[PDB]
Amino acid sequence: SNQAKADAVKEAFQHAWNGYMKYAFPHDELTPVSNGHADSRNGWGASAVDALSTAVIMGKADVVNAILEHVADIDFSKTSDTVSLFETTIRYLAGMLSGYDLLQGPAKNLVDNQDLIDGLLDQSRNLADVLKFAFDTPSGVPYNNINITSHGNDGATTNGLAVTGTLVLEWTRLSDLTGDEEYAKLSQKAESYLLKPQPSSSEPFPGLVGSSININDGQFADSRVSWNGGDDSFYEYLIKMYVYDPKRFETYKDRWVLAAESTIKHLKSHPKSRPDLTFLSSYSNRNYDLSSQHLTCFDGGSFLLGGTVLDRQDFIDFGLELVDGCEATYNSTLTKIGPDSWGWDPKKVPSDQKEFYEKAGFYISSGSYVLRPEVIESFYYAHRVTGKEIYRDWVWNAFVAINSTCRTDSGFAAVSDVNKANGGSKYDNQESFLFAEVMKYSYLAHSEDAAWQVQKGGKNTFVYNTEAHPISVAR
């Protein structure tokens, strides 16, 4: 049963790995339709590094060794493109750190070359050392888009909420492993401005903050509240940091609790046609935006994690409602995969979607699916927290739908319309998170228990970064 299903996910992973190795390694990614390669992540081999933690968990030694040997020859000081501090941190930094924590712990018997394992930490340090100048601003709030050769930047005056608040987990982990406090200080100083928002008008409700921060003084530049892309990850890390080290980050937890409670009281929203469904809205100056994204579906998982860790049944109950809503956007489409974005504002229901809206509870704004993992991620937490089989079935149903409509001879491709036969048209794109997230969560939902699995209460010995890379907790 679950064993066969687990093996099935490993086959899907192996399939994409073979195609990637065949036509793109060591480039950042495989182009699944033309069977070529692309480098949207500075050319250090994003798909190889992001695939590391998943391969280790699946016990694929051949894949692990190949990736380790490539990590050893990466020169993080050279790239012809500008670098995103956020993307580089959540994929590359966390990916190598994750492999290190994994291979040094629960998976110690998988690789022989201890030198390639230790090389993971050395390279993580070299990478942070090349990127740390980004934090050298008046406030400590970094520039996200930098030029690592000239030390130049975007010229930007503000930095996004998520891009600013989704660095602390991995930069602090690097400090705890190297003994060098510099990494934690930099990231935590940047985070400090988010934990004590100013002006007060930038925090409409307790815990809910604006979407952008001034680099010059660290104050918010707007009061737009949301859990959507651009904001999401900030709230996710608030509670995860607490799981990482409850002693050092009790303050993060308090801030998340406030955010969680204000979200339930003010962002909760039900479609007119389906009062039984719950989604989250965005808030800006007393006005509500009744639309959401696939990205936002990570929310149910955040509420479930904090719920079990804090033993708050109300957060758990709410998380399941968010999970149900996201599952609704998946099982209502033709392909059984959810849309990239949707709405439920009665006044804006498109004429050609009137009847879909009336029965499904929402209209599709963007029907594309770019191999995102947020819905399966929350399904995974729901299963681990409640232990109910239904949530595991939803992960499987989604995986089969993805395997059936996105699969190409070499890998998996993004799709243009989840509400049309075979997904409409395939995009010649396969993001690295296919390896890091979609395949990991799908596999974990059906694989045997282990330390790297999400646990209930205070039993977690690993915490997942935003790219699904398992990081060992402190101490």
Ligand X SMILES: *[C@@H]1O[C@H](CO)[C@@H](O[C@H]2O[C@H](CO)[C@@H](O[C@@H]3O[C@H](CO[C@H]4O[C@H](CO)[C@@H](O)[C@H](O)[C@@H]4O)[C@@H](O)[C@H](O[C@H]4O[C@H](CO)[C@@H](O)[C@H](O)[C@@H]4O)[C@@H]3O)[C@H](O)[C@H]2NC(C)=O)[C@H](O)[C@H]1NC(C)=O
Ligand Y SMILES: *[C@@H]1O[C@H](CO)[C@@H](O[C@H]2O[C@H](CO)[C@@H](O)[C@H](O)[C@H]2NC(C)=O)[C@H](O)[C@H]1NC(C)=O
Ligand Z SMILES: OC[C@H]1NC[C@@H](O)[C@@H](O)[C@@H]1O
Of these residues, 340, 345, 352, 417, which one is catalytic?
Answer: 340
Among the listed ranges 117-125, 198-206, 213-221, 325-333, the one in contact with ligand X (CB under 6 A) is 325-333
> Does 327 engage in binding with ligand X (CB under 6 A)?
yes
Q: Which two tokens stand for residue 32?
A: 């699944």
Least distance in Å: CB of 369 to ligand X? 17
Burial class (CB in 10 A: 0-12, 13-18, 19+), 458: exposed
**Binding-site partner at residue 327 among ligand Y, ligand Z, ligand X, none, CB < 5 to 8 Å by type:** ligand X
Q: Strand, helix or coil at 429?
A: coil
**Contact 170/90 with Cβ under 8 angstroms?**
yes
466 known ligand binder: yes
Phi and psi, residue 389, nearest 5°: -65, -30
**Binding-site partner at residue 150 among ligand Y, Ca ion, ligand Z, none, CB < 5 to 8 Å by type:** ligand Y
Using the minimum distance from each CB to ligand Z, give the nearer residue, 101 or 437. 437
> Does 466 engage in binding with Ca ion (CB under 5 A)?
yes
Least distance in Å: CB of 325 to ligand X? 7
Using the minimum distance from each CB to ligand Z, give the nearer residue, 290 or 371. 371
**Contact 363/350 with Cβ under 8 angstroms?**
yes
Q: DSSP state, 42? A: T
Amino acid in the structure at residue 67: I
Judge whether 340 counts as a catalytic residue.
Answer: yes
HSE-up (13 A, CA, CB side) for residue 202: 19
Q: Which two tokens stand for residue 345?
A: 């504002």
> Does 376 engage in binding with ligand X (CB under 6 A)?
no
**Binding-site partner at residue 191 among ligand Y, Ca ion, ligand Z, none, CB < 5 to 8 Å by type:** none
Least distance in Å: CB of 466 to Ca ion? 4
**Binding-site partner at residue 277 among Ca ion, ligand Y, ligand X, none, CB < 5 to 8 Å by type:** ligand X
Q: Note the residues at the interface with ligand Z (CB under 6 A).
A: 233, 295, 372, 374, 433, 437, 466-467
Using the minimum distance from each CB to ligand X, give the nearer residue, 228 or 378. 378
> Does 334 engage in binding with ligand X (CB under 6 A)?
no
**Binding-site partner at residue 8 among ligand Y, ligand X, ligand Z, none, CB < 5 to 8 Å by type:** ligand Y
Among 57, 241, 328, 402, the residue binding ligand X under the rule CB under 6 A is 328
Beta bridge partners of 117: none
**Contact 334/420 with Cβ under 8 angstroms?**
yes
Largest CA distance in the chain: 62
> Does 89 engage in binding with Ca ion (CB under 5 A)?
no
Beta bridge partners of 205: 208
Q: Which residue is nearest to ligand Y (CB)?
A: 150
User: CA 271, CA 99: separation in Å to the nearest integer?
Assistant: 42
Q: Which two tokens stand for residue 245?
A: 């080290």
**Binding-site partner at residue 203 among ligand Z, ligand X, ligand Y, none, CB < 5 to 8 Å by type:** none
Q: Note the residues at the interface with ligand Y (CB under 6 A).
A: 8, 82, 147, 149-150, 152, 400, 403, 407
179: left (phi over 0), alpha (psi -120 to 50) or beta: left
Q: Which residue is nearest to Ca ion (CB)?
A: 466
Among 40, 331, 416, 461, the residue binding ligand X under the rule CB under 6 A is 331
**Contact 272/262 with Cβ under 8 angstroms?**
no
Q: Which residues make Cβ contacts (< 8 Å) with residue 38, sequence separation at least 6?
A: 24, 27, 28, 29, 31, 429
Q: DSSP state, 268? A: E
**Contact 151/133 with Cβ under 8 angstroms?**
yes
First to last CA, the chain: 37
Least distance in Å: CB of 110 to ligand X? 35
Least distance in Å: CB of 414 to ligand Z? 11
Q: Strand, helix or coil at 16?
A: helix
List the x/- string, 303-322, binding to ligand X by CB under 6 A: -----------------x--
**Contact 221/203 with Cβ under 8 angstroms?**
no
Among the listed ranges 25-33, 109-117, 244-252, 384-392, the one in contact with ligand X (CB under 6 A) is 384-392
Q: Which residues are catalytic?
A: 340
Binding residues for Ca(2+): 466
Interface residues with ligand X (CB under 6 A)? 276-277, 320, 324, 327-328, 331, 386, 388, 390
Residues in the annotated binding site: 466
